[PDB]
Amino acid sequence: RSISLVKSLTFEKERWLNTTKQFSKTSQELIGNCIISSIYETYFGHLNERERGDMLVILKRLLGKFA
């Protein structure tokens, strides 16, 4: 049973390996993601779709400006 369980969890193992590999990228981008999430939470309740898109482009380019 243990051998069958080990052999039957290759997909779970490679998914866990992929998540551990992508943990570096998620931790690198955590602060920016929190910034932009709070920006949506407190700045976009009263804006239209095209205004939201334009302000999102402005925010993205200005956040990439500061590296």
């Binding site: 243990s2 051998i3 080990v6």
Partner: peptide, 11 residues
């Protein structure tokens, strides 16, 4: 999981 695999390989 790695510890279980190592134990299975050793035995």
């Amino acid at each position: 999981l790695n510890e279980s695999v190592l134990k299975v390989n050793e035995l």
